[PDB]
Amino acid sequence: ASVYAWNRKRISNCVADYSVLYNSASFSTFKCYGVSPTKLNDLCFTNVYA
Amino acid sequence: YFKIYSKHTPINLVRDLPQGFSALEPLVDLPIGINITRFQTLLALH
Question: Cβ(B12)–Cβ(B30) under 8 Å?
Fold first, then answer.
């Protein structure tokens, strides 16, 4: 997406191994704020955008 | 997110909205993200 237009859509109902998003090696170019990546598979999400 | 609610009842007042308490259950929530600022209601005919 263009930086003034975004990709904002609602992921819903789903499951994933969210830890992939930090534990897969080439993703190691990242950050997190409040939440922490190692907890994400036990943390009950709600709905998701990006 | 387009949130939709409703209530249905028989009535006496033909002109207008009646006095007395009512509250609406949620029909649906939609993920749709639309820029909404205008709308119109619709009929249909043979």
Answer: no
DSSP, res B15: S
Cβ within 8 Å, pair A12-B31:
yes
Q: Is A35:A43 a contact under the CB 8 Å cutoff?
A: yes
Q: How far apart are CA A8 and CA A6, in angstroms?
A: 6
Experimental technique of record: cryo-EM
Inspect the interface and report whether the beta carbons of B31 and A8 lie closer than 8 Å. no
B26: contact with A, CB 8 A cutoff = no
Write phi, then psi, for A45 (nearest 5 degrees).
Answer: -65, -175
Q: Which two tokens stand for residue B25?
A: 């259950």
